[PDB]
Each structure stands twice: as structure tokens, then as C-alpha cells.
């Protein structure tokens, strides 16, 4: 507990940019694209106010558009006088992917007609399309093969406080070891994480901070309408914060909270506000109506585990169950506790042979060990129970591919 | 119940079945079969024939059957075992786990075939486990898969009885003969024998 992430002060003019969404649509062969930027303001509306959105590729300006506030008619009462949408055409856009993280820069300027700048905001833009078609998750029209890993925010000395150096180190080790994707298990990450994934090139599953694993049954709270408000804020505020990051290609409703009606409601909310990304959730069987992707945890390659209500079918078998058509990507697999990863090759042989088996996220990146000091001041790796904490789950906090100090297992 | 239509020797296999001039002769082989056997409860599936590639004639006759008798599914293996002329994925000799990516007409692992993007049909092999002589090795691998996968609904072994004929030596003693033993040439020798039982129905 504590104030474990940055604290800052931001000054904004009274007449300000209060929000902006960036989207990129493409033609059939991705040779042409349109960047659509919806900008919202707060403060006093004036006819002389203007919004200019310009797009840059390095020091080269690719496009720019300007317009006064006033959106198209929405319903019987009119439209949003405090909003405006700019549309910019881009020919032969340099596409974003984990393979080639091409990025453009969108600058959003709030200014007066006479040319006086009031304030400017901006973001890195990655031109890419994410969509599920005919049962396959596609990125820019091509079927992905997720070489991912689950990554908790953990530091042996600083606990859950993240720093740029540690983030960069994790990303480099990941790419150097052929990983192209990461799942934010199981909450929105430090804001710099997304910036680094955008620039270095890694596919990200952004996950809502919702896990009620300890409830009995697991969905006791998620199926309770009285908890819908609290859950909704965890999902909606995540989307409102990270929707402009190209690295985020999939939204997750959380983790191990069973399957409740609140999940279906929030699943639809996301699909409604942001159709550019698929939504996944593993709770309640990995294939409920709240997930566009069959995303089981620890389902085996050939062996079925027919648990009542929430069976873990062999992944090859899962795909062809009567009426099933969705792609399958394990949100968690290959538990790396100590001397582990036996049978890892079996998953990959299957991933490569089956089009709809599009990978998974290994569990997990780093051991959650903490440093303690003996009588002589010598440091040692501690785990559950070493702090007098009880009850505890001892060494179960250590199942990463690398030690806490980032040394490889 | 399978229509008497096989043009295996043509090159390519669908040279005649894709030719509208052979539609008449083909249609009678399908239509007259249905007209004769449609009241038999034992018949649960209609087949358009065997190894004749996939031609437009197949699509036309497939529809004709669906139209006149919607009580039974229609299947046909030609042209890849999963064409628009079959309600059932019915390959011949597709293996359990191993793919055989032949050009145009691949024989995918049956487990993999089921989940190909957009595929939803059941899979029943019209032919599998070739029983030529000392054979049927790996037979249990098919059954383990049939039982685990709901949509893998079995298949038909190839085949029931050796097609050997009887001949008599100088002493009048009979012996089992195969291709070529009658002066017939060209011939495909012992290939006419791959049944689970000998011609006299003695079990292999
Ligand atoms: Na695959
Ligand atoms: Na663990
Ligand atoms: Na079956
Ligand atoms: Na034969």
C-alpha cells in the first residue's frame, strides 16, 4: 500500500482540451488511411476558437487540418457544440506492428482564429487495424502469432513502484528472447509502460483492475448489480486513459472473477465505445459471451481437464467444439515455477499447425521475490511468510522466466 | 448410398464432371438412385459418387438432391473432401495428427481440419485405415480421436473383402488370384486385395 506511482501538478487554461480520441481506418490493402481525431473542450465556447490537428512522421509534416468547434447533428436536440472531429487522409501510411513500430506524432492545438496558441496536447500514433475475421485475430490483415508473457509490476527492492530503467530492461530482455506481446496482469500499468511498448514494439493486452478470486462462488460480486458501478469505473476509466496507444490491441475485463452479468454489460460498453479492439475475459470458462477470444489459463495441448461448469478442454479440441468459431489465445500457460517449462515445445508445435491457435501469454515474467537482510547485512531472496505475514502462500509468488533482479532462469 | 459415378482415370480428375455435356448421363446415375432407394430407412446419407474430382455437375446434382430429399445429408469426397458439394467433410486417408499439404487437395490432420477458419461441418472419413495385407497399424489412434472430438464422427475402413478370384492349378486345386493372373494387362496386381476378411470371408 501507499502512494506507489508518480504525483504531479498540471496547469491547464480555463478554455482547454478536455479529451481527444485518435482512430485510424484503412482501405482494403492498407495503401490508404484516414486519421480521425475527435477533440473535446471545456471552458467558454467562442466562434473564434479553433482546433488544428497535424500529423508528423519525424520532422516531416504529413497532414494538417483545422476547424471551429461544432460537431455533426447527433439526435433531435442537435450535436456537441463543444466537440469537433478532424479527418486527415494519409497515403501509403507506414504501418505499426511489433515487427516494425512505425510511429507518427499527432499534435492537437487549441487556438484562436488570429493564430494565438491556447494549449497543445499530443500522442504517438501507430497506424494499425486490429480485427477478428473468420475466426482469426488479424493485425493489418495478417493473422498474429502471440509470443506473449504475463508481467506484473514487481521490483525486489522497491516493491510495486516502477521506474523507467526497470521497464526498459524488461522490454529489451523480452524482445531479445523473441516475445512480441505482454498482458498487463492484472491491472492498468504505469503510464510509461504503454509509451515504451508503442515505441519498442510489443502487443499489449490492457486489463481492468478487477479480480475477486477469493469470493465464493467466484462471481458473487460480479453478478451483483450493486457492484456494477464500482466495476464499471475500473473498466471505463482504463479505456478513457489508454485508448490512444497503438500498442494496446486487446482490452481485458479483469481476471479470475467468475462470470457475472456485470461482465456482459461492461463487455458491451467497450465494444460500443471502441470497436477498434477486441475484448477478452477468461472468467467463467474462458469462452463466455463476455469474450471475443477463447482465452483459457493452463489448458493443455492434447489432454482435456473436464472440470464441472468450467472445464479446460485440450486447446485443439476446444476450437472445434460444436458451434465454436473464435480464435484461441491462452491468457496464461506454461507455469514457470522454478525448474519448469517442460512441454513448452508441444504448445508451439500446436500454435504453428493450427491457424486458430494463435499463441498465449506465459505465466509469468518475473519471480515476485523480495530482498531481506540477514544478521550480517547480507541480502537474500524472500517469499511468502518471510515477513511474518500469515496466512501466506509461501514460494508460490515465484514463477517467472527471470529472477527478481532480471537474471534469466 | 452412392451413385455409380467414378472417373478417376481422367486428367485432371474432373474433366468430365465439370463438362456440361456429361451432366445428363451423370444426373441419371444420381436421380435414378434416389428414386429407387429413398424409402429405405437404413440409407441415412446420399453420396454423389467417387474420385471424379469436383465439377460444376457435382454442385448441380448436390442441389437437386437437397431439393427433392431434404431428409438426408449429401456427401462427396472429390476435389478436396470439403467442397460446396458436400454437407460432411469426408476425406480419404487423412491422418489423425499429421498434415499432408498436397497442392489443391490437401489432406489435413482431421483434428486440424475441423477448426480451419470458417469450417463448421462434421468430419467422417469415407475411407481410412487401408487394410492391405498385414495392416491397420495405428488404428487405435483414429478411435481415440473419434471419441475425444465431438465433430470427428468416425469413418469407413477400406475395405471389407479382398477382391481375389479363384483359379485352379493342373491338379484342380483352387488358389486365390489377383490382377494379372488372367493375362489381363495392364493390371494393378495385388492391389485389389485390402479387405479385413479374405474373399471367402475368413477374417484377417
Ligand atoms: Na496458429
Ligand atoms: Na504463482
Ligand atoms: Na466424436
Ligand atoms: Na486397393
CA of B66 to the centre of ligand 3 (A): 25
- The closest of A103, A29, A114 to A66, measured between CA atoms, is A114
Residues of A with CB under 8 A from a CB of B: 134-136, 304, 314, 316-317, 319-323, 325, 353-356
CA of B34 to the centre of ligand 2 (A): 63
Question: Which residues in chain B are contacts of A316 at CB distance < 8 A?
Answer: 111-112, 115
φ, ψ of residue A268 to 5 degrees: the values are -65, -35
**Per the annotation, does B191 bind a ligand?**
yes
Classify residue B77 by burial, with Cβ atoms within 10 Å: 0-12, 13-18, 19+.
buried
Cβ-count burial A118-151 (b if 16+ within 10 Å, e if not): beebbbbbbbbbbeeeebbbbbeeebbbbbbbbb
- Taking the C-alpha atoms of residue B63 and residue B69, their distance in angstroms, rounded to an integer, is 10
Beta strands in A126-264 (DSSP E): 130-133, 136-139, 142-143, 146-150, 181-183, 203-207, 248-252
Relative to the alpha carbon of A365, which ligand is closest? 2
Question: Which residues in chain A are contacts of B96 at CB distance < 8 A?
Answer: none
**Per the annotation, does B40 bind a ligand?**
no
Q: Test B111 with A317 for CB contact under 8 angstroms.
A: yes
CA of B191 to the centre of ligand 4 (A): 4
**Nominal resolution (angstroms):** 2.1
User: At A100, is the secondary structure helix, strand, or coil?
Assistant: coil
CB nearest B149 (choices: A135, A320, A354): A320
- Taking the C-alpha atoms of residue A288 and residue A254, their distance in angstroms, rounded to an integer, is 14
Is A256 designated active site?
Answer: yes
**Per the annotation, does B54 bind a ligand?**
no
Element (H, E) at B67: helix B56-68
Find how far residue A306's CA is from the centre of its chain. Answer: 30
- Taking the C-alpha atoms of residue A339 and residue A317, their distance in angstroms, rounded to an integer, is 29
φ, ψ of residue B32 to 5 degrees: the values are -70, -25
DSSP secondary structure of B46-62: EE--SS----HHHHHHH
A82's grid cell? 463543444
- Approach to solving: X-ray
Task: Name, in order, each residue with C-beta under 8 angstroms of A12's C-beta and a sequence gap of 6 or more.
Answer: A119
Domains within chain B, CATH numbers bracketed = 1-204 (3.20.20.80)
A76's grid cell? 433531435
Question: Which residues in chain B are contacts of A353 at CB distance < 8 A?
Answer: 99, 109, 112
**Per the annotation, does B130 bind a ligand?**
yes
- The closest of A233, A231, A234, A245 to A274, measured between CA atoms, is A245
What is chain B's Cα-based Rg? Answer: 19
Q: Test B150 with A319 for CB contact under 8 angstroms.
A: no
CA of A354 to the centre of ligand 1 (A): 4
Residues of B with CB under 8 A from a CB of A: 99, 109, 111-112, 114-118, 120, 148-151
Is B170 designated active site?
Answer: no
Chain B interface, best mutation among A144, A316, A349, A350, by max B CB count within 10 A: A316
Q: Test A136 with B117 for CB contact under 8 angstroms.
A: yes
C-alpha distances out from residue A342 to A314, A333, A336, A338, Å: 17, 12, 9, 11
Q: Hunting for cell 516531416 — which residue is that? A: A60
Amino acid at each position: 500500500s501507499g502512494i506507489f506511482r508518480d504525483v504531479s501538478l498540471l496547469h491547464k487554461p480555463t478554455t482547454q482540451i478536455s479529451d481527444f480520441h485518435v482512430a485510424t481506418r484503412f482501405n482494403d490493402d492498407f495503401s490508404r488511411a484516414v486519421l480521425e481525431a475527435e477533440v473535446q473542450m471545456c471552458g467558454e465556447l467562442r466562434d473564434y476558437l479553433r482546433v488544428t490537428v497535424s500529423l508528423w512522421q519525424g520532422e516531416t509534416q504529413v497532414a494538417s487540418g483545422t476547424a471551429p468547434f461544432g460537431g455533426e447533428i447527433i439526435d433531435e436536440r442537435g450535436g456537441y457544440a463543444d466537440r469537433v472531429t478532424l479527418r486527415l487522409n494519409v497515403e501509403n501510411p507506414k504501418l505499426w506492428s511489433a515487427e516494425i513500430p512505425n510511429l507518427y506524432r499527432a499534435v492537437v492545438e487549441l487556438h484562436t482564429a488570429d493564430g494565438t496558441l491556447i494549449e497543445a496536447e499530443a500522442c504517438d500514433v501507430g497506424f494499425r487495424e486490429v480485427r477478428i475475421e473468420n475466426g482469426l485475430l488479424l493485425l493489418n490483415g495478417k493473422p498474429l502469432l502471440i509470443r506473449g508473457v504475463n508481467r506484473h509490476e514487481h521490483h525486489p527492492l522497491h516493491g510495486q513502484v516502477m521506474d523507467e530503467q526497470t521497464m526498459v530492461q524488461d522490454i529489451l530482455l523480452m524482445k531479445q528472447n523473441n516475445f512480441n506481446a505482454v498482458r498487463c496482469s492484472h491491472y492498468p500499468n504505469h503510464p510509461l509502460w504503454y509509451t515504451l511498448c508503442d515505441r519498442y514494439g510489443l502487443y499489449v493486452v490492457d486489463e481492468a483492475n478487477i479480480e475477486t478470486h477469493g469470493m465464493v462462488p467466484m462471481n458473487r460480486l460480479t453478478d451483483d448489480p450493486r457492484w456494477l458501478p464500482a466495476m464499471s469505473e475500473r473498466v471505463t476509466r482504463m479505456v478513457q486513459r489508454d485508448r490512444n496507444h497503438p500498442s494496446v490491441i486487446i482490452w481485458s475485463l479483469g481476471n479470475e472473477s467468475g462470470h457475472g452479468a456485470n461482465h456482459d454489460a461492461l463487455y458491451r460498453w467497450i465494444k460500443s465505445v471502441d470497436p477498434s479492439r477486441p475484448v477478452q475475459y477468461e472468467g467463467g470458462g474462458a469462452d463466455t459471451t463476455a469474450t471475443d477470444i477463447i482465452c483459457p489459463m493452463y489448458a493443455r495441448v492434447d489432454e482435456d481437464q473436464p472440470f464441472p461448469a468450467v472445464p479446460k478442454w485440450s486447446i485443439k479440441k476446444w476450437l472445434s467444439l460444436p458451434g465454436e468459431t473464435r480464435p484461441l489465445i491462452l491468457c496464461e500457460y506454461a507455469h514457470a515455477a522454478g525448474n519448469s517449462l517442460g512441454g513448452f515445445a508441444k504448445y508451439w508445435q500446436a500454435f504453428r499447425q493450427y491457424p486458430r491457435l494463435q499463441g498465449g501469454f506465459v505465466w509469468d515474467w518475473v519471480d515476485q521475490s523480495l530482498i531481506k537482510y540477514d544478521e550480517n547485512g547480507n541480502p537474500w531472496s524472500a517469499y511468502g511468510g518471510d515477513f511474518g505475514d500469515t496466512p501466506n502462500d509461501r514460494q508460490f509468488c515465484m514463477n517467472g522466466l527471470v529472477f527478481a533482479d532480471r537474471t534469466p532462469h
